[PDB]
Amino acid sequence: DDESSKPCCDQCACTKSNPPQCRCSDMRLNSCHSACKSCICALSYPAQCFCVDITDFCYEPCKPSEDDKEN
């Protein structure tokens, strides 16, 4: 964890593998950012983007908060 540009998320989807895989921030009807690995994008209307980046825990949704649930 460095700056506040931590890779956040919005959508979450995992698959049963070994170990399991987990791609979050799957689709977005706009554009991604520089917080993923490599995002594919269609600069055509309706704009579209995808993050082929995958992890093993699904980053939490965006807009964190210690009031909700974060120990």
Swiss-Prot record:
Annotated site, Reactive bond for chymotrypsin, chain positions: 43-44
Record function comment: Inhibitor of trypsin and of chymotrypsin.
Entry GO MF terms: serine-type endopeptidase inhibitor activity
Disulfide bonds: 8-62, 9-24, 12-58, 14-22, 32-39, 36-51, 41-49
Family: Belongs to the Bowman-Birk serine protease inhibitor family.
UniProt site (Reactive bond for trypsin): 16-17
GO cellular component, one term: extracellular region
Keywords: Disulfide bond, Protease inhibitor, Serine protease inhibitor, Signal
The protein, known as: Bowman-Birk type proteinase inhibitor
Protein's UniProt keywords contain Cell wall biogenesis/degradation: no
Full-protein positions shown: 40 to 110 of 110
